[PDB]
Amino acid sequence: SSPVRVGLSVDASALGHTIPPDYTGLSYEQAQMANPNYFSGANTQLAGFLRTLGRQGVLRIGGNTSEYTFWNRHAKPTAADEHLAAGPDKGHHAAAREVITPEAVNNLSEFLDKTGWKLIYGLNLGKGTPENAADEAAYVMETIGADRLLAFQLGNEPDLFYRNGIRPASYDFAAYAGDWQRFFTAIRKRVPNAPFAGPDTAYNTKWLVPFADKFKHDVKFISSHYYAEGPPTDPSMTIERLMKPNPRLLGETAGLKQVEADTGLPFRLTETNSCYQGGKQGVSDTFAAALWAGDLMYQQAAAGSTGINFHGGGYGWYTPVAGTPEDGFIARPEYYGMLLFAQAGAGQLLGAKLTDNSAAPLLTAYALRGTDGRTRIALFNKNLDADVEVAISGVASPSGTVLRLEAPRADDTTDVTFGGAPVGASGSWSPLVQEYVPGHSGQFVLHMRKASGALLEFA
Ligand SMILES: O=C(O)[C@H]1CN[C@H](O)[C@@H](O)[C@H]1O
């Protein structure tokens, strides 16, 4: 009904980046490692949610709580630890001290085996010692093994140590570089092959750029963070603003691309979500987050990112997966945007140009030549008030199907489906609605409701 009529032109000759198979990922608080039941081979529910997000992917463990977690080689989990549900750190005050045990690391290894995911593991540079980091790294490497361990990170958001009471106001990149080298040196004595990434901050000029320049021979990739919300001085983030382009993201991405050109280091977005402080109720925990997250995954893949890790845990407002081993796990709305990406699969991005779209400017579209040879198109109609009718040219196929990413309202906290079905227990998901996209004159026409997504697959 009264859609904006737009054109989408796919160009199979306009080659973009190849999405790596381990692009997807999640980030969790290191405090969660206090509970050996969470990242465990026994946590079949959570493992299933990860496998549905990707047969390959990366689990990053870090966050603010990584400055408050203290590995101890003799420790055993307490009764309290065995029930801990560590949600995103809200950033209001110091996290609780937690202990990480051998048992938790042993169980993490088995969780990585059950999921097939690789690991980015934070070490406690904020408050811990080099020697303990070396010992923790040694045990992780011993246990998890080089093939599954992608990187250690030496501190989380070190540019914010002072804001969070971890370093004095004078702490700057030069001070952090000294800490980093002390930790690096200690760890490499115990773990000569230890891989690193950093600086595990948002892009900025005073930390990330000089980090890359100084440590490019010592790290495997650059790790960056991104939250769509800006500083606390901004108007409170809304769904409307979450759907819009974020010029800061665009600039930071360009910055990362220049770092890669200068240093050779690829970049991964190792911690991201919509809003700070564990998210914003009525924004982060809504269907709009699915549109935002799915679109972000493709925007960053098209920009040459190696991958992404959406922060979460517990029942945090922005978590993709919520729950506990005792109570079970569920897919929150954001998960469904990641599910659309998962179902599209890997391949090479292609040119996909929108026209006649000024009245529906928040529609995005990405075309992909899948590794199976089939063309897919992921569309995010992020316009909150405009339906669209998309005239698709540049695809020659006898049959196109669509899987829709839907909820009845953008701010819904539930009622989210993909392919006509919710995700069930343990990540199980099957499409239940089959819809063909009408074809005529070598073109296709796709209707999309306001605030919806679609994944098209062409035979
Ligand atoms: O929700 C947030 O604000 C995020 C910011 N980044 C930190 O590394 C996380 O621990 C968490 O506090």
Author numbering: 17 to 475
Q: How does the study describe this entry?
A:
When the 2-position is modeled as an alcohol, the B-factor of the 2-substituent is consistent with the 2-carbon. However, when the 2-position is modeled as an amine, the B-factor of this functional group is depressed, which is anticipated for a nitrogen being accommodated within the electron density of an oxygen. The 2-hydroxyl is within hydrogen bonding distance of the catalytic nucleophile and an active site asparagine in all three of these structures, thereby mimicking the interactions seen for natural substrates28 and other inhibitors. The 4-hydroxyl of 4 forms hydrogen bond interactions with the enzyme active site, for both AcGH79 and EcGusB, see Figure 2AC.
Siastatin B is a potent and effective iminosugar inhibitor of three diverse glycosidase classes, namely, sialidases, β-d-glucuronidases, and N-acetyl-glucosaminidases. Herein, we show through crystallographic analysis of protein-inhibitor complexes that siastatin B generates both a hemiaminal and a 3-geminal diol iminosugar (3-GDI) that are, rather than the parent compound, directly responsible for enzyme inhibition. Notably, 3-GDIs are a new class of iminosugar glycoside hydrolase inhibitor, that have been shown to inhibit both GH2 and GH79 β-glucuronidases.
